[PDB]
Design an enzyme around this catalytic site. Structure first.
Site, PDB file in Angstrom:
ATOM      1  CD  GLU A 283      -0.838   5.914   4.749  1.00 22.32           C
ATOM      2  OE1 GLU A 283      -0.882   7.137   4.416  1.00 22.32           O
ATOM      3  OE2 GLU A 283       0.247   5.335   5.037  1.00 22.32           O
TER       4      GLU A 283
ATOM      5  N   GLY B  29       0.804  -1.190   0.000  1.00 19.15           N
ATOM      6  CA  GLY B  29       0.000   0.000   0.000  1.00 19.15           C
ATOM      7  C   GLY B  29       0.851   1.260   0.000  1.00 19.15           C
TER       8      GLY B  29
ATOM      9  CB  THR C  65       2.138   8.911  16.355  1.00 20.50           C
ATOM     10  OG1 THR C  65       3.112   7.876  16.436  1.00 20.50           O
ATOM     11  CG2 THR C  65       0.838   8.324  16.976  1.00 20.50           C
TER      12      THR C  65
HETATM   13  C1  LIG Z   1       4.540   6.384   3.120  1.00 21.37           C
HETATM   14  C2  LIG Z   1       4.425   7.365   2.331  1.00 21.37           C
HETATM   15  C3  LIG Z   1       4.314   8.530   1.458  1.00 21.37           C
HETATM   16  O1  LIG Z   1       4.509   8.098   0.094  1.00 21.37           O
HETATM   17  C4  LIG Z   1       5.628   8.781  -0.455  1.00 21.37           C
HETATM   18  C5  LIG Z   1       5.154  10.108  -1.097  1.00 21.37           C
HETATM   19  C6  LIG Z   1       3.641  10.146  -1.302  1.00 21.37           C
HETATM   20  C7  LIG Z   1       5.684  11.327  -0.376  1.00 21.37           C
HETATM   21  O2  LIG Z   1       4.861  11.531   0.762  1.00 21.37           O
HETATM   22  C8  LIG Z   1       5.636  11.696   1.960  1.00 21.37           C
HETATM   23  O3  LIG Z   1       6.807  11.329   2.008  1.00 21.37           O
HETATM   24  N1  LIG Z   1       4.955  12.037   3.020  1.00 21.37           N
HETATM   25  C9  LIG Z   1       5.510  11.956   4.360  1.00 21.37           C
HETATM   26  C10 LIG Z   1       5.276  10.558   4.954  1.00 21.37           C
HETATM   27  C11 LIG Z   1       3.788  10.229   5.219  1.00 21.37           C
HETATM   28  N2  LIG Z   1       3.620   8.799   5.546  1.00 21.37           N
HETATM   29  C12 LIG Z   1       2.532   8.088   5.166  1.00 21.37           C
HETATM   30  N3  LIG Z   1       1.445   8.664   4.752  1.00 21.37           N
HETATM   31  N4  LIG Z   1       2.505   6.791   5.395  1.00 21.37           N
HETATM   32  C13 LIG Z   1       3.520   6.121   6.039  1.00 21.37           C
HETATM   33  O4  LIG Z   1       4.476   6.661   6.605  1.00 21.37           O
HETATM   34  N5  LIG Z   1       3.410   4.810   5.989  1.00 21.37           N
HETATM   35  C14 LIG Z   1       4.299   3.878   6.667  1.00 21.37           C
HETATM   36  C15 LIG Z   1       5.632  12.626  -1.223  1.00 21.37           C
HETATM   37  C16 LIG Z   1       6.251  13.803  -0.516  1.00 21.37           C
HETATM   38  C17 LIG Z   1       6.416  12.472  -2.486  1.00 21.37           C
HETATM   39  O5  LIG Z   1       7.634  12.296  -2.528  1.00 21.37           O
HETATM   40  O6  LIG Z   1       5.651  12.314  -3.672  1.00 21.37           O
HETATM   41  C18 LIG Z   1       6.558  12.213  -4.764  1.00 21.37           C
HETATM   42  C19 LIG Z   1       6.813  13.628  -5.368  1.00 21.37           C
HETATM   43  C20 LIG Z   1       7.814  14.481  -4.555  1.00 21.37           C
HETATM   44  C21 LIG Z   1       5.846  11.127  -5.562  1.00 21.37           C
HETATM   45  C22 LIG Z   1       4.365  11.205  -5.276  1.00 21.37           C
HETATM   46  O7  LIG Z   1       6.092  11.304  -6.931  1.00 21.37           O
HETATM   47  C23 LIG Z   1       6.463   9.787  -5.143  1.00 21.37           C
HETATM   48  O8  LIG Z   1       7.766   9.732  -5.709  1.00 21.37           O
HETATM   49  C24 LIG Z   1       8.583   8.761  -5.091  1.00 21.37           C
HETATM   50  C25 LIG Z   1       9.616   9.502  -4.260  1.00 21.37           C
HETATM   51  C26 LIG Z   1       9.294   7.972  -6.210  1.00 21.37           C
HETATM   52  O9  LIG Z   1       7.757   7.916  -4.230  1.00 21.37           O
HETATM   53  C27 LIG Z   1       6.612   7.369  -4.872  1.00 21.37           C
HETATM   54  C28 LIG Z   1       5.748   8.500  -5.461  1.00 21.37           C
HETATM   55  C29 LIG Z   1       5.508   8.286  -6.949  1.00 21.37           C
HETATM   56  C30 LIG Z   1       5.972   6.570  -3.749  1.00 21.37           C
HETATM   57  C31 LIG Z   1       4.972   5.627  -4.357  1.00 21.37           C
HETATM   58  C32 LIG Z   1       5.427   7.534  -2.654  1.00 21.37           C
HETATM   59  C33 LIG Z   1       6.346   7.860  -1.462  1.00 21.37           C
HETATM   60  C34 LIG Z   1       6.793   6.581  -0.752  1.00 21.37           C
HETATM   61  O10 LIG Z   1       7.512   8.557  -1.831  1.00 21.37           O
END
Ligand SMILES: C#CCO[C@@H]1[C@@H](C)[C@H](OC(=O)NCCCNC(=N)NC(=O)NC)[C@@H](C)C(=O)O[C@H](CC)[C@@](C)(O)[C@@H]2OC(C)(C)O[C@H]([C@@H]2C)[C@H](C)C[C@@]1(C)O
Ligand SMILES: C#CCO[C@@H]1[C@@H](C)[C@H](OC(=O)NCCCNC(=N)NC(=O)NC)[C@@H](C)C(=O)O[C@H](CC)[C@@](C)(O)[C@@H]2OC(C)(C)O[C@H]([C@@H]2C)[C@H](C)C[C@@]1(C)O
Ligand SMILES: O=[P-]([O-])[O-]
Ligand code: NA
Length: 498
Positions: A143, A94, A212
């Site tokens: 989520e 997820g 949290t």
């Molecule tokens: C967990 C989580 C949040 O998801 C972040 C991703 C959604 C990032 O979100 C965050 O890091 N948020 C802070 C943590 C929040 N935590 C959660 N909701 N859940 C959590 O911790 N679970 C254990 C955001 C900031 C981000 O990097 O988005 C990128 C653009 C800057 C994306 C959306 O392009 C992103 O790029 C990369 C870096 C390649 O990650 C991809 C996704 C395609 C994955 C799929 C998304 C995550 C892992 O980076």
């Protein structure tokens, strides 16, 4: 004497798997070899992330994944178990991007849990993936399920659990049995989606890892700490959504459990879980962030705390103004709103104009850039002292964090957590937990030990009177009452004997 869990997420995107290398930081900045033997020993769990659920309603790797390169990356993680026989490499299904209410794969989550046949197919796929790639357990980070999804989700966890237990027996893994965790909501608004069924959610799990953190962000009206341990009366307060959950409780029971408004804090979320009967403290893991959230456009006066701000909340970040001074990772990621602890230390070390401040109520640090009007909320090795002490005092299962790649190079955040739990010479007996606001809810799961005089048949009890009867301490809600406690609605169970 039972070791605290230390559960760290290891995230790697599909393009980095498909081009995996340990010798080029521009391609893969956080390869598995940055998890050294000393870091391996300080972890109990690594959660490899993220897998997904596909349109066939099975657990699956992103379909663009190069399978040979995926196996290779996972094999490097599992090789770490050579350094630590307690260590598990979980995998996580997820994440926000896949599973949020508007996420790319959201319907697959809903559909995978919806019927008995779907749950069987999905549960089997999880355990098949786990065995095929060498993982040690399954983590679900949806989520978040809501509404009718929750009964389905519970059933799916129950079925996974049975299949994991079969696999433990098959493999003779009684010394390190296959585990099931979820990433749970860490704030009341999302928690309220499944709160009423929390004991059923937790029963099949080894841990529920509370998120949290992210309790503040650009979507809020004013800046705030994203992971405050305790409350600050000067900070914002929120409606307590849990008082509207389908619990079937009375006005007094609701009111005593769910003060509103309330401070959105780590302690709140932990207590909210403990209030519920059947949710053991040993399964509750406190999540902590290894990243800060940054805000711009803030006013002076209290270090940027509790200010209006001008941080865009849109995704993707809507322009190329990377205004988080000194954050090179933000330029690379094209988003100034989040910065790894690793990066934050550099920003603070450089001549970028930040002051590091400390809120002694919330027991958390924050950066303030007075000249540009910036505010950053994050955690460090100091806030981790108070959080570790809380984890010990409340008898929680341990700590979870997002994510390993955000720790500094020497792994100082992870080392600090491991020290506070396990170092023979670390002493926090005198660490002062402060006078920040504690969540004071009480529910059926966390009744205090109390004494009172025994109830006496015939006696007329005024409002507020306390008696002991059949194992508990009871308080009259109005007067004059002569009924036996528990026999009608006039008595509130407030405490437990002995
Ligand atoms: C967990 C989580 C949040 O998801 C972040 C991703 C959604 C990032 O979100 C965050 O890091 N948020 C802070 C943590 C929040 N935590 C959660 N909701 N859940 C959590 O911790 N679970 C254990 C955001 C900031 C981000 O990097 O988005 C990128 C653009 C800057 C994306 C959306 O392009 C992103 O790029 C990369 C870096 C390649 O990650 C991809 C996704 C395609 C994955 C799929 C998304 C995550 C892992 O980076
Ligand atoms: C600002 C604002 C209002 O916008 C809210 C949306 C931005 C919401 O904004 C508000 O309601 N603001 C303040 C009032 C309540 N405050 C909180 N609920 N705080 C809280 O839960 N802190 C963790 C907040 C609560 C929210 O849910 O943010 C999500 C992450 C925590 C979002 C931004 O990811 C959000 O998730 C979902 C639930 C899928 O909704 C998405 C959007 C992607 C839509 C696009 C945004 C809204 C409509 O839900
Ligand atoms: O956005 P920058 O000052 O590295
Ligand atoms: Na400076």
């Amino acid at each position: 004497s039972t070791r605290k869990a230390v559960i760290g997420y290891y995230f790697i995107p599909t393009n980095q798997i498909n081009n995996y290398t340990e010798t080029d930081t521009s391609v893969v900045p956080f390869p598995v070899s940055n998890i050294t033997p000393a870091k391996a020993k300080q972890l109990t769990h690594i959660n490899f992330s993220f897998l997904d659920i596909n349109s066939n309603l099975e657990c699956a790797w992103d379909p663009a994944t190069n399978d040979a390169k995926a196996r290779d990356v996972v094999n490097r993680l599992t090789a770490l178990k050579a350094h630590n026989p307690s260590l598990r490499i979980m995998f996580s299904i997820g994440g926000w991007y896949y599973s949020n209410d508007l996420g790319v794969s959201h319907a697959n989550y809903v559909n995978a849990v919806k019927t008995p046949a779907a749950r069987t197919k999905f549960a089997q796929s999880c355990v098949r993936i786990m065995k095929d790639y060498g993982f040690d357990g399954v983590d679900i980070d949806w989520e978040y399920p809501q509404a009718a999804e929750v009964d389905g989700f519970i059933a799916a966890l129950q079925e996974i659990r049975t299949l994991l237990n079969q696999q433990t027996i098959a493999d003779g893994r009684q010394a390190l049995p296959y585990q099931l965790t979820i990433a749970g909501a860490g704030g009341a608004f999302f928690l309220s989606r499944y709160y009423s069924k929390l004991a059923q959610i937790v029963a099949p799990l080894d841990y529920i890892n509370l998120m949290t953190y992210d309790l503040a962000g650009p979507w809020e009206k004013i800046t705030n700490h994203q992971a405050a341990l305790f409350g600050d009366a000067a900070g914002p307060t929120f409606y307590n959504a849990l008082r509207e959950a389908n619990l079937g409780w009375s006005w007094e029971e609701l009111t005593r459990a769910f003060p509103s408004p309330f401070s959105l804090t780590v302690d709140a979320a932990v207590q909210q879980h403990l209030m519920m009967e059947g949710v053991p403290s040993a399964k509750i893991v406190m999540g902590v962030p290894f990243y800060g959230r940054a805000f711009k456009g803030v006013s002076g006066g209290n270090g940027g705390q509790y200010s209006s701000h001008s941080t865009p909340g849109e995704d993707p970040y809507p322009n190329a103004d990377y205004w988080l001074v000194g954050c090179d990772e933000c330029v690379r990621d094209k988003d100034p709103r989040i910065a790894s602890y690793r990066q934050l230390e550099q920003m603070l070390q450089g001549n970028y104009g930040y002051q590091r401040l400390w809120n002694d109520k919330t027991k958390t640090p924050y950066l303030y850039h007075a000249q540009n009007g910036l505010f950053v909320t994050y955690d460090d090795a100091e806030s981790f002292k108070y959080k570790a002490k809380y984890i010990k005092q409340q008898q929680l299962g341990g700590v979870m964090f997002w994510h390993l790649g955000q720790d500094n190079r020497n792994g100082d955040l992870l080392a600090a957590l491991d020290r506070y739990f396990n170092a023979a010479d670390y002493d926090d007996s005198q660490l002062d937990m402060g006078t920040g606001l504690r969540y004071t809810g009480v529910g059926p799961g966390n009744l205090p030990i109390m004494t009172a005089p025994a109830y006496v048949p015939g006696t007329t009890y005024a409002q507020g009177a306390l008696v002991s009867y059949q194992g508990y301490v009871w308080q009259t809600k109005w007067g004059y009452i002569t009924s036996a406690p528990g026999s009608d609605s006039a008595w509130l169970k407030v405490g437990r004997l002995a």
